[PDB]
RNA sequence: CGACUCUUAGCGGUGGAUCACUCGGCUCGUGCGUCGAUGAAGAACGCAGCUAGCUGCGAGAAUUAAUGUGAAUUGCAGGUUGAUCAUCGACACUUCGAACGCACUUGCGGCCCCGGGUUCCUCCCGGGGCUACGCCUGUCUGAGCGUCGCU
RNA sequence: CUGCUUCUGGGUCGGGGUUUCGUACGUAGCAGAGCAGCUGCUGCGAUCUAUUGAAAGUCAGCCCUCGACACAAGGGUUUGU
RNA sequence: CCAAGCGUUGGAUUGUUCACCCACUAAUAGGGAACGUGAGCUGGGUUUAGACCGUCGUGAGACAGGUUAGUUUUACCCUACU
RNA sequence: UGACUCUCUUAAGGUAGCCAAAUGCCUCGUCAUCUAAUUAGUGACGCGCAUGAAUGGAUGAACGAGAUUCCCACUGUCCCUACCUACUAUCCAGCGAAACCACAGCCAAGGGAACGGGCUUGGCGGAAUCAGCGGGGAAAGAAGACCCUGUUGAGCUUGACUC
RNA sequence: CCGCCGCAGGUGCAGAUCUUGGUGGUAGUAGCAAAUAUUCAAACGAGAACUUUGAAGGCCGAAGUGGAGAAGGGUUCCAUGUGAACAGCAGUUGAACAUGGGUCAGUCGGUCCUGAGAGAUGGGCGAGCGCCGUUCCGAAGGGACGGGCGAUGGCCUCCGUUGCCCUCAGCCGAUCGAAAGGGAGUCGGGUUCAGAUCCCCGAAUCCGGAGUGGCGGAGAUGGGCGCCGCGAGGCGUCCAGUGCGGUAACGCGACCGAUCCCGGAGAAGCCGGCGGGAGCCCCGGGGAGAGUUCUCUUUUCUUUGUGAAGGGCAGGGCGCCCUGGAAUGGGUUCGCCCCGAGAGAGGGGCCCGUGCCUUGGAAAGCGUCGCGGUUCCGGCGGCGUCCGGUGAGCUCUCGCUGGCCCUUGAAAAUCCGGGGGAGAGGGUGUAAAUCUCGCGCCGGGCCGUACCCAUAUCCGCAGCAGGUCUCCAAGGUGAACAGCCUCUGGCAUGUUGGAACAAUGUAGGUAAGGGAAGUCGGCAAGCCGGAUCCGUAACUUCGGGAUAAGGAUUGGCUCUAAGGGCUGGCAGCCGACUUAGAACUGGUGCGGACCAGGGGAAUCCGACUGUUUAAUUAAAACAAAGCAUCGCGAAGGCCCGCGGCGGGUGUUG
RNA sequence: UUAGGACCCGAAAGAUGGUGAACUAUGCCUGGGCAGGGCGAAGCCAGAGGAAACUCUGGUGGAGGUCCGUAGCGGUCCUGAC
RNA sequence: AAAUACCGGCACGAGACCGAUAGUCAACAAGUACCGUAAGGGAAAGUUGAAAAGAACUUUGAAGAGAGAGUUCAAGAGGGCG
């Protein structure tokens, strides 16, 4: 049985020090001190409440070390936004700007006639 | 504490080295009126001020 | 009998009175009547061959120079073209401090200059000169459907 | 309050007497609820039974020792009509 | 009348002293000792501070009115006694 | 006894409730109940000194280190004390205070500032002591906190005075 | 130093609960009594109840007397001495004393960010020291992308480097504020008398950087004709190229681009349940060294590994996607819950991987068994460092999913992706501009770092039974982090010992018969106590009351039945824990210690939970939900302020 | 005999300007922490009884200023120790 | 300007003053040691001798502490010592 200290001089169980068990090649259990868990980015839709696909879960700061590929998904509002609200917004962007040249076809009608 | 300032540490340093008693040649010379160092300071006696 | 206890004297302890001194006071009088952004008062921290305090002092650190003084300093070591003291006009005077680049953690900046890294050609390291507010006179660049001006 | 050489004396130990508790360890048992293994033997097994009114304590403030083993022929301080 | 030698109790209710009652009893007499006795106790009662009620007061508050909760210290001296 | 009646009467005379209650002076109220006996508890009785409606009235399951009462069981609370254990106290080695202290330390009476350790008159009186002990020293403690006085104050209040 | 004659005064002490200093009696007295406890031998030494070492017997018993830190301390740390004084006996002993020695960092904190808040400037007030206020009454930006004449370093080549002035720009705030919040990145072995993520060895890693940019790779070597000649091909030209693959989710080692915009991460509460993962414990083996052996025991005990960072892999998870169309509704959980808004079923994709394996890596470490080096050493060899089963186990962690709120649970630094398309890039190459790709290169200053962390290093005048914030957490019994016992680890019974065992104490117990007669009062003590199994009233706000009350069993040993995985109505194979039943059996003992409710009938008050006089009152008092009025529609109510175009409620209605 | 420190010692107070929230009171910010059990609310599935609203029953579920109780927090009673 | 004020500051002279519990809080390592979180509070403490000649050497004890000696007019002046 190990009975085992901090390494560290934070001697409370607070956010930034949180550890685990870890057996050495010296033959002994000693703590090592777990980075958090960072997660996944959020869709900038903002309505889907589960976190973006082929983007790292990873701390903030972490993400200067990170290649681009490791960042974003390739796509356009690819690791920004969930291509479920993507191809909504292609649809929208289209149907509504659609609808707009009905309004510029039907003002086309009823001041010929006066 | 073990967590120090720069400023307390060399405040503590001036303490230690102003904590030895006096050279035994001092009271040999003419004017003679120290016997001991009488401003000699103890960490349980006295608390240094802080 | 003694032992114990009291009284007195001698001697001896305990204690620091008395008395005798006195490089300290207090009081009165006199002359003088001088601090500081050229960094004051104060504070911190340092410094001696052996030095804790006290004074003396400021990386040139119980002092340098200079003038005077003319052989010590001294607790103990050691090594006259001026020892040592006084004086002090030259120099020097680390850090905080009205405290002054922005902050009090002695933590972070800028610009110009220099030196290493080089052989200007940047980062880097070290060093240096500047960088506080209020105001005054002049300067400079401006601003205004202020007042007008000329096209 | 006593004891400290009648070849005697107390003590120490042991032996009896005493009483207390209630049947030791070991062995033995085709006594044992059974069950497990091998083809009747044999393992685990609370417990019961004999050995066994057994074992254990018992004067330190119990009784008698005449059995062992030593030890005891001292020291100190005072005291007179 | 001589007479204090020796006895004079167990309890219910109340802090009670005072009573009152049950029951025993030879009898259930009365008292004193700083209204014996808190470095002996107990703290129920009073009588600090907290609270509640009744009456009183404009009020703060008041009441030998009722109510609950509320620190009870020291002997090693000298005598006395053992 | 009081529905009812007559008058004075003020703002209107306490309604529903509740009670000798944490509220009743008298008081240990009266009656019942719990007892062998109860100034206790409880349920009733209301001219209630001086009950009463958000100054809240009446109740109330659950709850409470809240205040009372009776009952069963349980007990050294007691009748009535005894024994045992640990640590003390005790004795010794070493170590070593303090409170307190006019002088001090045996009584009875007397007088006295009316309750003497000393005075008066009698009792009488015998070194140095140890563990106890709580009678006394009107023991210690702290210039009475009660009480009154002072032309001494403070916290609070208001229909005090002056702002 | 003094007499006489004059002068002058801080001029005479027993008192003042006088002041200061000293010393008595008490008195060698009270005392050195909290938390179980010490004994034996030896050593050093003048000297031992205490020191040191060995052997005993003990305690703490993982919510510890253990191993570490924060705050505080400031050298107390460690060694070498002496043992005057101090450590309420002692002392060869100490945290005393005196001489010395000791704290090593890009990675661990501080620095940095902002929080509640603090606080300049403008402004306002102010007799004034100052004060208010912090975006409000302010000309509150000293930055870039752009264009010529000049100019300096370099063949002024043409950019770096400059200046004029012309295009271009919100946050709305200086500054401070956390050694527990945000916050890139270091771990493993070895080493010291005292220092380690700091030192040494070895493995990585983060940020920053470079003047004509140091290597490779990507950007980038496609298209279509026109002649030569047996064809590849050679060579002239008109063109392209700021990367590819997957139906998709998304992938591939890079994969241009500014002001602007947009979003994300940073960055979210407590509680419940479930699952995975480790560590730990447990279990059956195999090694190694010890323990026991008086009999029995294939036995009992210890030890039995593998870092950061990459890759691969199980393993979790998905509210991701693809064909596809479901009532006879299906899937699915402990609970949920999902479904034409596309369920089952199949094929994928992604995020997390703290587990396994591999590189690190056996070279170290550990267990051993030996050999040298008289001491000069991280000495050198031989072996081993194993194979399984495990589980509502415990703890931490990663998830899935709920429940509660008139409660909704931080900002900011910082970082990244996206959308835009101003630009830049080269002309078929010796390609260019450009790159979040793989190596390479250089750098990381400053301050803290010792030790105690509490019945002896802190604060209570002290080695004071007080107080003082956290991390790790073994075996048995058990519901249990309860209590008790033991292992690792630590200790010497808490400021003294020896010999007695009186009183009276303090703290424990035990009592015949009675039973509250004691007493203000059942105060103190006692009884009851667990679990299974019966049985459970009045009253009620139907929730409770309730463990009401009141009964029965409990030991040991031995069986029996029932309750499950797994591999291809079956057989085989690995079981881990309980419930129930009956036997047998002991002197009716058995929740055997420990743990651990006395019970009923009423009354008063307060609904309850909560709170309260720290140090005499824990209460019926306060609070409380509920209920009810009252003020106020903003130049307002209510309040503050010396003051103000002031401030709180107010980020309000 | 005064007035002044007025023979010396003595108040409870009154005033002015400063220092403190390391204890404690309260708000706020930011962190950490709280075994093991008992009762068993909503929702949910099956079943049983009758004609619907329905009424009974057995599981499941894990709410609560819930209860027993450790750590923590507090401080009742002994009016114990001291 | 001058006459005028001056319990601070620099450098001086003097006293019917005080003589170490006096005189300034301070004759001395005094605004020191020490106490309080801080504002602030704030001491005690002078003397060997003419000259250290400050007690060599011998001897008991583990050493402290002695006995002899020795210095000095005197240790009846032995390191806080007229």
């Not at chain 1, 289209?94 to 040249?101: D, G, H, P, V």
Request: charge should be positive; hydrophobic fraction near 30%.
């Amino acid at each position: 049985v190990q009975r085992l200290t901090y390494r560290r001089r934070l001697s409370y169980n607070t956010a930034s020090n949180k550890t685990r068990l870890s057996r050495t090649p010296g033959n002994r259990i000693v703590y090592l001190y777990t980075k958090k868990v960072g997660k996944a980015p959020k869709s900038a839709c903002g309505v889907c409440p589960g976190r973006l696909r082929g983007v790292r879960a990873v701390r903030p700061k972490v993400l200067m070390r990170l290649s681009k590929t490791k960042k974003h998904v390739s796509r356009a509002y690819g690791g920004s936004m969930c291509a479920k609200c993507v191809r909504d917004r292609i649809k929208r962007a289209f149907l509504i700007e659609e609808q707009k040249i009905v309004v510029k076809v039907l003002k086309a009608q009823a001041q010929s006639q006066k | 504490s073990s967590h120090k300032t720069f400023r307390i540490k060399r405040f503590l340093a001036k303490k230690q080295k102003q904590n030895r008693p006096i050279p035994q040649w001092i009271w040999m010379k003419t004017g003679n009126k120290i016997r001991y160092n009488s401003k000699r300071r103890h960490w349980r006696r006295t608390k240094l001020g802080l």
